Amino acid sequence: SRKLLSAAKILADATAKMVEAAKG
Amino acid sequence: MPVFHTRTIESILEPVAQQISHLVIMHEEGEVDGKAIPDLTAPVSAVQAAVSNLVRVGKETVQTTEDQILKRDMPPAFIKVENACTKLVRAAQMLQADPYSVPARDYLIDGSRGILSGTSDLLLTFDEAEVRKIIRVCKGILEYLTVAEVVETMEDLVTYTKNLGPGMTKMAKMIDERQQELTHQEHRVMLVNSMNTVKELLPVLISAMKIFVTTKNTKSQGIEEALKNRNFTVEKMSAEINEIIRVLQLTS
Numbered sequence A: 001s002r003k004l005l006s007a008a009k010i011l012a013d014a015t016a017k018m019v020e021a022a023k024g
Numbered sequence B: 001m002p003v004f005h006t007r008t009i010e011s012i013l014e015p016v017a018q019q020i021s022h023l024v025i026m027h028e029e030g031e032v033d034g035k036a037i038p039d040l041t042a043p044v045s046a047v048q049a050a051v052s053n054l055v056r057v058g059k060e061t062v063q064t065t066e067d068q069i070l071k072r073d074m075p076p077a078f079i080k081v082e083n084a085c086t087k088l089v090r091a092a093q094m095l096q097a098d099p100y101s102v103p104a105r106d107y108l109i110d111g112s113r114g115i116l117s118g119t120s121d122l123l124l125t126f127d128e129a130e131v132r133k134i135i136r137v138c139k140g141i142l143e144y145l146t147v148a149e150v151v152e153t154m155e156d157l158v159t160y161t162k163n164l165g166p167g168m169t170k171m172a173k174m175i176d177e178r179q180q181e182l183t184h185q186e187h188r189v190m191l192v193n194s195m196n197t198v199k200e201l202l203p204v205l206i207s208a209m210k211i212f213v214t215t216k217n218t219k220s221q222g223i224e225e226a227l228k229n230r231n232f233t234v235e236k237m238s239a240e241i242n243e244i245i246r247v248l249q250l251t252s
Helices: A003-021 B007-026 B041-063 B068-073 B075-097 B102-144 B154-180 B185-215 B223-247
Strands: none
Touching: A003 B007, A003 B041, A003 B102, B007 B102, B041 B068, B041 B075, B041 B102, B068 B075, B068 B102, B075 B102, B102 B154, B102 B223, B154 B185, B185 B223
């Protein structure tokens, strides 16, 4: 269902915000 | 690197996979050497929490699941994402002490890559599971088509038509909704055509068993002829259902 797919998303958001921060 | 698979997988991972590919190209792949990465402490902690939370939820998914490949297949992905987080944490320590650190940049690439790929893994494994729940519906309908052969009375056929109702209604709603989440058009086409063939042959099956019950209770007619048409409908339905099960397992 849902709880896993949002946890994964939140992780993907965060990894992307982290690699934004790194510049690129 | 190959297309994400479903609209959910693709919309979760696509922003990340995009940002990573850039960051590579930039620092790595030559280019921005002697470069300078700012301080990642805060973003990396956010990532580290989101990996706690992902492994929290996933370990629940694992212990609270009926699926037996889910149990075995998921855990490795927890090990892959934790490891990658570890690299991200050394990355941000190193960068705090030397913005120009070339080991740190490398850890941050591998760190990020291993986060993408471990979560890819976790999401493929979860999706395989979900596919298997549609395969179970498909396989039980195939099992029930096996038994059409034994209907002989109008009362058995009323009974048979009433159990096979739910079943096809559910199969159809599953394949339809699954087809929508697909990202490969050659795969949505295939599912839908098959489900169309199936749906239209259902009344052809019921008519053909009615024909059959009716010459097997009017003590003669042409009963060979009636039974082989029934057997042909059943084999065509089966074959389509087997394709549905096959094409559902395709991922590229």
